[PDB]
């Protein structure tokens, strides 16, 4: 059963959570190929492991930039959580290490690109297509929340499509293990729950709100709350009002009204029946939850695969050389990395 699976999953998690993996590779063991993505602290690059021949995605964080942006604790959270988790829809962290200048997390390379890219290009996904991806997020959040983890950055930009057309959840930069409530203002403007915006303490229910934003965006092709500036987006989120496109089914509309719910005593995922309020909703009635987990369901979309290190499903980025200082920077702050 689910309870039996979750018990054994918590046991494997806590062993790695209590005794994390550290310094499991060297920079000189990889060949840098291309930048797959960027952020304020660095970039994600396609790398090749010299000894195995395998391709990986290596996230590089400049420690000085992490310190300047007050993200030391968030960065330690990311690496500690990632090395400890194991779920079919979470990207696997293969190695981690650090040097004088940077932090490195080497993960399995997902070549099918971001959901964001296919979503913007295509326009919108049909309801069975969006339901397929949403189901995977539901099982992923059920796994993470049972471990007391909050993801806090769900968006199409963070969801990668694998060779079998399944989702690989990426970027644990805002992920946190917290038993009670938390207060950090973080995430993406369009996906923030009203309680984050209103500087109230919040919990795991912000992830279920983010799920509502994701399902709406997948099915409509645009988020439920958009504007040109973040400030205008927050005004829209905190005021009730959500308009659904006329092509949305009654079941979709009903489930979204229960996910995009301001009232925490009424928001799905949070209540007494928990995740089963979502799993058992009528919009998910065709979903075989075990087959989705086992990856036995035929994906509505399989991306083009040219070669193991092909980057055609990703955008091009300005390349910048990796500079490793002769002097160790922020050693005390990133000691446990």
């Amino acid at each position: 059963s689910v309870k039996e699976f979750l018990a054994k999953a918590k046991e494997d998690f806590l062993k790695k959570w209590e005794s994390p993996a550290q310094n499991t590779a060297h920079l000189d063991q990889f060949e840098r190929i291309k930048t797959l993505g960027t952020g304020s602290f660095g970039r994600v690059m396609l790398v090749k492991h010299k000894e195995t021949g395998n391709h990986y995605a290596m996230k590089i964080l400049d420690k000085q930039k992490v310190v300047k942006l007050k993200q030391i604790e968030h960065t330690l959270n990311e690496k500690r959580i990632l090395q400890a988790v194991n779920f079919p829809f979470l990207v696997k962290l293969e190695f981690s290490f650090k040097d004088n200048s940077n932090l490195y997390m080497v993960m399995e390379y997902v070549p099918g690109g971001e959901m964001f890219s296919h979503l913007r290009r295509i326009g919108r996904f049909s309801e069975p297509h969006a339901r397929f991806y949403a189901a995977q997020i539901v099982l992923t959040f059920e796994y993470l929340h049972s471990l007391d983890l909050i993801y806090r950055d769900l968006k199409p930009e963070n969801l990668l499509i694998d060779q079998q057309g399944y989702i690989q959840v990426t970027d644990f930069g805002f992920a946190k293990r917290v038993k009670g409530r938390t207060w950090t203002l973080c995430g993406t403007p369009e996906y923030l729950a009203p309680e984050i915006i209103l500087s109230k303490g919040y919990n795991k229910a912000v992830d279920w709100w983010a799920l509502g934003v994701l399902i709406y965006e997948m099915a409509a092709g645009y988020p439920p709350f958009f504007a040109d500036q973040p400030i205008q987006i927050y005004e829209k989120i905190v005021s009730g009002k959500v308009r659904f496109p006329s092509h949305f089914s009654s079941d979709l509309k009903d489930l979204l009204r229960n996910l995009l719910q301001v009232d925490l005593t009424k928001r799905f995922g949070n209540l007494k029946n928990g995740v089963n309020d979502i799993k058992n909703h009528k919009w998910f009635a065709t979903t075989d939850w075990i087959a989705i987990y086992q990856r036995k369901v035929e994906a509505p979309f399989i991306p083009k695969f040219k070669g193991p290190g092909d980057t055609s499903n990703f955008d091009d980025y300005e390349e910048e050389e990796i500079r490793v200082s002769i002097n160790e920077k922020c050693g005390k702050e990133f000691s446990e990395f």
Partner: peptide
């Protein structure tokens, strides 16, 4: 349309975190 309003907005590209 809402689509046209979205497509014409400055937030159709990759969205940054806060």
């Amino acid at each position: 349309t809402t689509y046209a309003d979205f497509i014409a907005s400055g937030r159709t590209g990759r969205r940054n975190a806060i």
